[PDB]
């Protein structure tokens, strides 16, 4: 509780920068065929705000895990000449730029 506006600002932030919404729901292997047999730990922003309210995060550390989980799920199932690898990427790097000390 002493982290949980903290992480809402930086999830807020977080989710501005994929104004498609790429990454804001779970991704179903409806429209991405084979993707929980290739992604064992799916992540995505909507069960990132899940767990915030939920309390389910202890630390900054362990929200930025997810945060890198998803990002790098992207850049594993998505070739990197794809729009959401290239969005994954720069995404990551910015917002673990926003997110150090």
């Not at 990197?80 to 910015?94: E, F, G, M, R, S």
């Amino acid at each position: 509780t002493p982290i949980q506006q903290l992480l809402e600002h930086f999830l807020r932030q977080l989710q501005r920068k994929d104004p498609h919404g790429f990454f804001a729901f779970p991704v179903t292997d409806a429209i991405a065929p084979g993707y929980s047999m290739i992604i064992k730990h799916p992540m995505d922003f909507g069960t990132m705000k899940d767990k915030i309210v939920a309390n389910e995060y202890k630390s900054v550390t362990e929200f930025k895990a997810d945060f890198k989980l998803m990002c790098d799920n992207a850049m594993t199932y998505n070739r990197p000449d794809t729009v959401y690898y290239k969005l994954a990427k720069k995404i990551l790097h910015a917002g673990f730029k926003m997110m150090s000390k």
